Scaffold this motif. Structure first.
Motif, short mmCIF file in Angstrom:
data_model
loop_
_atom_site.label_atom_id
_atom_site.label_comp_id
_atom_site.label_asym_id
_atom_site.label_seq_id
_atom_site.Cartn_x
_atom_site.Cartn_y
_atom_site.Cartn_z
N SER A 107 4.78 1.52 -5.03
CA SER A 107 4.80 0.30 -4.24
C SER A 107 4.33 -0.88 -5.11
CB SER A 107 4.01 0.48 -2.96
OG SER A 107 2.67 0.82 -3.21
N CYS A 108 4.43 -2.09 -4.54
CA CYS A 108 4.16 -3.28 -5.34
C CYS A 108 3.80 -4.45 -4.42
CB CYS A 108 5.35 -3.55 -6.26
SG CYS A 108 5.04 -4.63 -7.70
N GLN A 109 3.54 -5.61 -5.04
CA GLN A 109 3.26 -6.83 -4.30
C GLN A 109 4.31 -7.05 -3.23
OE1 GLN A 109 2.48 -7.06 -7.85
NE2 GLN A 109 0.31 -7.29 -7.33
N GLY A 110 3.86 -7.42 -2.03
CA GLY A 110 4.75 -7.64 -0.91
C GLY A 110 4.98 -6.41 -0.05
N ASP A 111 4.64 -5.23 -0.56
CA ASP A 111 4.64 -4.01 0.23
C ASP A 111 3.33 -3.81 0.98
OD1 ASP A 111 7.24 -3.11 -0.57
OD2 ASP A 111 6.37 -2.34 -2.45
#
Ligand SMILES: [Ca+2]
Length: 223
Positions: A172-176
């Motif tokens: 996962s990453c930024q915005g998730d």
């Protein structure tokens, strides 16, 4: 989500988008009037968007409902991200069907090695930035606590678990942030933090929902 796949429209029916003029975090619908997300996603003026696939196009299954009350965990620490969990009450109940549905809370904690589904509209690159319009999905296992603590010395509390791949490439990453980690049909995690995205030896770190079920149930019963 880095290294994932396109979920398909409304295949993750409990996934919500939190919108303050733009998508900024995910969340999970846990009954017709309540959403759970990450405390670090707190802000005023939240509209909850249910039934979304493409967040930039009205496709016909959306429900847009304002929040009436947000409750950050009593013991949230923004410096360590311990207790990174928040409840949001909707101003009116959502209309539940196959495409908009709640996810069950766990009755027991999941073990390392369990495969889970992580989803969101966050960044899809580990270097640079590309934000998708449609929902992305990733299947990933829960990692052992010993592996997790080795990767992040001094940073993992009993309220966190790691999931993903130590070799990198899928995360996962930024915005998730705030979105679901679902294992065996139960909500076991909330997307919380990590060092970069999809880096070797730096898996994602998730809020351990099974530690919070009593607080969730008590809070919903009284608010
Ligand atoms: Ca849409």
């Amino acid at each position: 989500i880095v290294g994932g796949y396109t979920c398909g429209a409304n295949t993750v029916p409990y996934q919500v988008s939190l919108n303050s003029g733009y998508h900024f975090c995910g969340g999970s619908l846990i009954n017709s009037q309540w959403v759970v997300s990450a405390a670090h996603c707190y802000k005023s003026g939240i509209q909850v968007r249910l039934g979304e696939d493409n967040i930039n196009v009205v496709e016909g299954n959306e429900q847009f409902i304002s929040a009436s009350k947000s409750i950050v965990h009593p013991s949230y620490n923004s410096n360590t991200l311990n207790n990174d969990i928040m409840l949001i009450k909707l101003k009116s109940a959502a209309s539940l069907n196959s495409r908009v549905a709640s996810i069950s809370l766990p009755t027991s904690c999941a073990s390392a090695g369990t495969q889970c589904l992580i989803s969101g509209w966050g960044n899809t690159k580990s270097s640079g930035t590309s934000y998708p319009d449609v929902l992305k999905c990733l299947k990933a296992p829960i990692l052992s606590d010993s592996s997790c603590k080795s990767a992040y010395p001094g940073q993992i509390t009993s309220n966190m678990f790691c999931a993903g791949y130590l070799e990198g490439g899928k995360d996962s990453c930024q915005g998730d942030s705030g979105g679901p980690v679902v294992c065996s049909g139960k909500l076991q995690g909330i997307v919380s933090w990590g060092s970069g995205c999809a880096q070797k030896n730096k898996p994602g770190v998730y809020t351990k929902v099974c530690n919070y079920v009593s607080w969730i149930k008590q809070t919903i019963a009284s608010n």
